[model samples]
Target chain A: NLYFQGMKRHYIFASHGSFANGLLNSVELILGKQPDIHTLCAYVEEEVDLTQQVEALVARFPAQDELIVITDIFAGSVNNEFVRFLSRPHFHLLSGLNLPLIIDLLISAAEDNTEKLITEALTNAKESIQYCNQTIA
Target chain B: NLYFQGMKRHYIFASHGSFANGLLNSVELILGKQPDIHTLCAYVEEEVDLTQQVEALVARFPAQDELIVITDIFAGSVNNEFVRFLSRPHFHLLSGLNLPLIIDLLISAAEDNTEKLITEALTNAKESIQYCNQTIASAM
Candidate 1:
């Protein structure tokens, strides 16, 4: 685990509404509660700016931890809010939120190479999408 | 809309937990309220059997309407619960839940051919998942 290496890994599910929290609920159903996993649900009937909320969360993160942020959709307002943090260290942002991807990433977090971990997780998650009627027929 | 064609189309999001409901919430935030869509969240801290829940939902569907059931994972318990219903007429089952796939399918419900619509929706949703860091870095 990243903890043995003196760096913890943190996952943030940022979304437009209750999606982030909902995703966390599903994830918990499948894998139980994850201490490192967090959610940032934006536009949940709040007048507060998303940017400030995002900035506040990012600023408070432990410097030594790895920050992996997964957003609901690519180029959407939530993802765009995190695009600015791309320049920071240990920050990885992936688009397209799905359970397979999140589960794969969390299950395989023991790997040393975050790059390889992300690539494989994305590919596996993508492959998980199938029109089952034809395949099972 | 499918209403004009005398055949109604229904969408079902079934999963092990709250994923189905969560997906519906995200869909509403993006595409407004979808009356045609419904959710079946199995094993939600209840002793009720999933098969009974699945059967009840499927049995209640109007005989004339097209049923599109999307589950959380392939070969997953939730998806397998709906597999037996595939023999029923006008029933379509898709696995692997994602916003892109669900949104694309719902928005394209007007297509004449369900087979063609599903194939294209699956392709588009798969393409939407990307490692943004590499792509943005290449562009920069």
Candidate 2:
């Protein structure tokens, strides 16, 4: 039950556009409900201010809330802007979006050892994004 | 020009959600102005039927269009549903989406030797998606 006690953990599948939302949908198909996770897709429209959208998401959590921001590219604006949160102790940032990474992160967010497993989790998650050309075979 | 002449030659990035659009954004960042590539995201709401959505995208093409559909999962509805088009000629369906796959598809979309490079591009695209542990360790 103590797994519930923390800085109010949630994952943000932040990317350039609909990938995060799509990945979230794919996630739902596999693990059922992912209420704690949120998605922030950038550049949906010319008039929309992505900075405000990201800021509003960050505001939803407390200053110390454990927020993990996963993005599509390292230097991309959607990911770069969130770099400001790096100084915050509980905020973590990861780049490169893939189905495997999302599934692993969502399922493990509730475990007691989730924090320690972050590095190991990232390791295994990388393996999930590999391409398979089953058509040629 | 004959190779380009016979087919509509549009790239379809179809999947469960914003992945097609998301991957397009990434692809554009590298190679500018990818006009023929279109994106399809599925199941946005309960009232929305993804099959119809895919059908609508597929409709943009002619019967024998060289439509390349990239799906997020192998047997997922989005992928399998599009499989119905496989019987149609020049329709390629690739799964396990990644940035590399998108770029390789776009750059060589106009090559006379495209059929020859298909296996190589797919192989390299698979290689680029990695764990990045050494990269992280260096940063530390």
Candidate 3:
């Protein structure tokens, strides 16, 4: 509803398992609202392969609709399989997702210039990792 | 069982929601077998506070048993509560979790200079956050 022009931006969270959904809930706990996010579960102790799992989800979306796919590991199989989707004009993929990154992007959902959004989110998410014992000491 | 002399290291994963459990499952998917990690779920539509949830479980541990607590965020309330346990000798806490960090530690859990293990896991997990689009293009 925010952007009335062009393909509507949709968020896709593809992780090794469900914790991506948990990551979504954690973000919601901070923001007090759930963002419009779709989850693509991989390696769920099921017979389905990661490629088939994701491919099935992507196929459900319309061609013109823009997609912002988020994965846990940058070099992992889940992210690697998603790499093929980058060629699409509306496809945006971001790996190394933490709660802060999801919150930052979903809170400020934007379709225009997704690259800039990812750069800013990465800077914010890195702070989530802190040396608690030393820093507090 | 490996750390039989002093205390068996118990890895406790605490987070604001069910995501920590999700993370543990994600780790299992990466590894060849399921691990024996304990999860402390909090604020996942729970009426109780995180501190109370964690305290109840941790109270059941033996005196010499070491605690390896992992959290999703360093500054969140869950980790803040876990911070109190760090004063103990065998207690270690890490945040900014991904599958890599969990796998690295669980695969080779030990009290044998755990500080080094923590460092190694952190280093491995950090590299997992690279920008694939930029990373692949630079190789060409």
Candidate 4:
């Protein structure tokens, strides 16, 4: 039930394959089930183009809803495909899909401004990556 | 073929469920199949304890081989379980398993010192996260 300026906010986790779903699974283990979050898994099967999958998902998105998409890698096919839709109103795209980022964003989805929420989540996620060997050394 | 100070280096991707395997799948798509890489998917089914799974994996790990484990989260059960193995020789543990970190580590695994490689990969992974909306807006 999170909203950004009265627009319903939806999250999409897109990746090269099952990583998207896997992330959802992992996050769910921490945050429990999220009804607003979805996944777009690319190249899970042969003979299916990424463009087709991207187009289909975008087409089904409600016009009045806001979309925040987190993808596997920057400049990758999945991110690039969503890049084309950046011009669409209420569409926000972010690359670098990780557990911390996803968990932080979902937790703070309804707590603040969209840009502020995203920035804070991203900052937290960046700080989460650590080399344990050196930390305890 | 990567080694940590002459010890054979092994990579383990551990997580709560299938996330570990899922990450492996994503990385393999980019780096091709890695024989030295392995996954320990914890708690996939009912009634299986994580300690048992961790014990089995560690028991099979050749004592001569070095382990570099990248787990799902810091302080989580998966990482904590591996914490017990830290006393073992040449065991390295890293938390926050993400595609960027894994890909960067795998690509640079053979090219540098273990500590240096881990630091660089961690740095790169941390830098890889960005808010694209502001990035493009500021580009103008």
Identify the leading candidate in terms of TM-score: 1
lDDT of 3 by residue, A7-58 (tens): 6777887788887887777777777765458887776667887777888888
Q: Candidate 3: how large is its RMSD?
A: 3.0
lDDT of 3 by residue, B35-74 (tens): 4588887776647776778778777776587677778787
TM-score rank, highest first? Answer: 1, 4, 3, 2
Which sequence of candidate numbers ranks them by lDDT, best first? 1, 4, 3, 2
- Compute each candidate's TM-score over C-alphas: 0.93, 0.68, 0.85, 0.91
- Where model 2 places Cα greater than 4 Å from the true spot, the runs are A1-8, A29-33, A44-65, A84-87, A110-112, A115-136, B1-8, B17-34, B44-65, B83-89, B98-100, B107-140
Model 1 over residues B5-103: C-alpha lDDT tens digits? 567889999887887887788888898998988899888866899888899999988767889998888767999999999888999998888888877
lDDT score, candidate 3, position A104:
68
Summarize candidate 1's per-residue lDDT along A55-101 as a digit string, tens digits: 99998897777899998888578888888988898899998888889
Candidate 3, superposed: residue stretches over 4 Å from native: A1-7, A45-49, A62-65, A108-112, B1-3, B32-35, B45-47, B108-111
lDDT per residue for candidate 2 within A77-107, as digits (tens), equals: 8776777666666777776666756666666
Give the per-residue lDDT of model 4 (tens digit) for B53-134: 8989888777778789998888778888988887887788998888888888877876637788888888887777777777
Kindly report which residue stretches of model 1 are placed more than 4 angstroms away from their true locations once superposed.
A1-3, B1-4
DockQ of each: 0.75, 0.29, 0.61, 0.73
Highest lDDT against the true fold, candidate: 1
Say which candidate scores most in DockQ.
Answer: 1
Model 2 lDDT tens row, B20-107: 6767776776677689888777776678787787777787677656676777766567777887776666767776676656766666
RMSD of each: 2.3, 4.7, 3.0, 2.7
For each candidate, the alpha-carbon lDDT, in order, equals 0.85, 0.67, 0.73, 0.83
